[PDB]
């Protein structure tokens with residue numbers, strides 16, 4: 001009867017039963033992790049692909065009426081696949097927002113409305129079409145969905161200049177657990193605060209986000225400078241941890257470290273001419289010179305930073321043919337105090353070259369991201385943060401998991417004394433189920449279980465998130481294994 005309920009309001013075109021011949025390709029289209037696409041993963045009973053907001057409301061009403069929970073999917077990047085799989089057998093539908101990819105840019109007001117189903121590449125491209133001197137601070141990977149990226153916070157190469165995506169959202173269109181359509185005004189301050197950074201799923205289905213668009217110069221400068229240990233990587237990184245978080249807001253230098261080399265990748269909101277003396281003055285250890293400069297427009301920096309590409313702009317931002325589906329494991333940490341130089345020695349000399357070693361990505365904070373009060377948004381990793389670490393393990397055959405998974409665990413153990421503690425902070429969008437998962441009692445996720453992983457992602461904000469959840473979704477309709485549990489008065 002679920003199908004009959006849906007088809008009353010939604011075209012058959014947009015309803016994919018699990019038995020449907022079209023269902024496997026719709027399911028797989030935006031799966032980004034080969035661990036979660038294989039037949040042993042728990043599959044949704046139905047996938048619904050709305051093209052307008054009433055289809056979302058209808059699906060929710062139908063879901064409530066027929067006791068079918070919904071997991072919403074935008075770009076499909078969830079590290080645990082929680083947008084399209086459950087961990088244990090469960091009946092659920094996926095509401096897959098991929099056909100709702102509209103981006104309307106008001107270049108004059110410097111605001112834009114973007115559907116959650118858009119990918120970052122489509123958002124970024126539409127901004128560029130409106131103006132060569134406007135930008136929006138979200139993720140690095142162009143295939144990330146707006147929905148998940150904004151709901152969990154969202155950060156990238158502009159985080160030092162403008163903070164996270166979520167703190168630059170000025171309104172939303174959202175469907176709640178009752179199928180009611182909300183904006184900022186009708187949902188109220190608590191719900192609007194929660195939705196912008198408090199994690200995907202928990203607070204309802206965001207249909208579209210209104211954002212403020214921010215200035216960038218017509219030319220930005222990117223560099224990618226690699227250092228092995230004999231070229232000085234240990235001393236350069238030992239300096240970087242102090243220097244990079246204190247650099248002017250216009251300069252962000254992230255690190256990608258894999259095997260024998262650390263690649264220092266910078267985006268500077270300016271020219272080589274001003275970048276050169278700044279580097280020689282503030283970060284001379286890197287040996288940056290004008291030859292390392294790549295001047296281009298902001299929009300051009302997106303494929304450049306992520307892929308190294310210089311002339312497939314539309315392909316890199318706009319292509320929706322997946323084709324990158326590693327088996328992948330991810331973890332993250334936040335660092336508040338400088339590592340001893342000997343820890344960098346262990347990381348670069350032993351950890352990164354062990355069997356199963358992954359990639360370590362280091363993003364420096366400070367400036368704007370750290371200026372924002374910790375409780376101002378649900379994202380708490382702000383004042384005092386030196387840098388974020390992401391531990392990324394890829395493998396490419398189903399039987400090759402043992403070594404990377406073991407390295408991932410062992411390194412997280414090794415790093416424990418040097419990273420944040422009590423709670424050990426982690427970024428919500430770097431979803432890591434090993435941080436803890438919910439217990440469900442009487443069909444409702446418990447506060448006590450949610451608190452364990454919840455304080456890691458959201459620290460002191462977890463409480464306001466759970467109280468908000470209690471008000472907007474007391475029966476815990478919109479949930480997953482690591483979603484905000486209701487705390488009800």
Ligand SMILES: Cc1cc2c(cc1C)N(C[C@H](O)[C@H](O)[C@H](O)COP(=O)(O)OP(=O)(O)OC[C@H]1O[C@@H](n3cnc4c(N)ncnc43)[C@H](O)[C@@H]1O)c1[nH]c(=O)[nH]c(=O)c1N2
Nearest residue numbers: 074075076077078083140141145147148149155200201206
């Ligand atoms: C290649 C690549 C690169 C990166 C990243 C991922 C990947 C795959 N990440 C992490 C990314 O931000 C995280 O996986 C997001 O939650 C993904 O959002 P999607 O919509 O793509 O995923 P997906 O559709 O799987 O959703 C993720 C979670 O949000 C919920 N959700 C999705 N749409 C929603 C909606 N409309 N309303 C409410 N909830 C919704 C889902 O139910 C799920 O729980 C990231 N992050 C980052 O900040 N900066 C970065 O540079 C990167 N880099």
Ligand code: NA
Nearest residue numbers: 329330432433
């Ligand atoms: Na994982």
